[PDB]
Assembly symmetry: C2
Homo-oligomer: 153 residues x 2
Amino acid sequence: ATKAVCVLKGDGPVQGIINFEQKESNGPVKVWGSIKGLTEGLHGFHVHEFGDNTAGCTSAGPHFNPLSRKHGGPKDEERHVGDLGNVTADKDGVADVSIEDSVISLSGDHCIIGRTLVVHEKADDLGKGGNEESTKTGNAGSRLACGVIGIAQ
Amino acid sequence: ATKAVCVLKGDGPVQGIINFEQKESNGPVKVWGSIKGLTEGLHGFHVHEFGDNTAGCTSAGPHFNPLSRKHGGPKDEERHVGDLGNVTADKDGVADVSIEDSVISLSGDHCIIGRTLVVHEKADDLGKGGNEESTKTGNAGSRLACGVIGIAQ
Ligand SMILES: [Cu+2]
Ligand SMILES: [Cu+2]
Ligand SMILES: [Zn+2]
Ligand SMILES: [Zn+2]
């Protein structure tokens, strides 16, 4: 148990304290929080498996996969158990996050604690992008800020 | 087949890498690292509970302590959970390290991923040096750098 945390940052001039609150056994991770500095538009907003912030945002791994799926948006069943959404930066990029996914957990299985959350640079192609580079990531270019999903209070 | 990593970043010159290997359900745990630019001879090497690092090292609270024991000795009977003691920063303060301790297991009940490991500024005195203080936090002084234990490579 309890309320995860994650504060994103990297060579990107962007950043963000992002929160995670999840009650009843398994089931709906409530994620809300904010992230500044960035360039308006959509941004991919994933989970990367390895919580190695070892050497940047390279180490995080590809998207969290338990039995290897291709990509998806949150709304599908074709999706990795790591890829949450796309997130919008409006002007002067307060990309105010709100989300309520049912796949990613906080205690058992789809264990994201000590995993990484990456907010990306290009706009998420969400599957629907008819190339293999989307099924791989969803085409969202850099890893601009990242951090380990640790444990707040 | 658990693994873990921790990039011990602080905002003094102090920049570290440190990991936890440990198997076969109740195989002890290991730490091997490279602590850096740390003041000679003896430093605090703890693991504080909430892997909240919002405000860097200080939101990580008390040592990982499920039990409500007093301060830990590297090996006391009555040791925090989170204090693993001291480390030796060979002259120029590189601290090549190694621990094998019973207590800092990461799976079947009691796992510490999603927590912080903070390396303390001064010479950590075991607690038993009776003072409800030295017993708080082993008379260690600042937290000069931290990192979150997550699943690694
Ligand atoms: Cu991604
Ligand atoms: Cu401490
Ligand atoms: Zn994906
Ligand atoms: Zn302690």
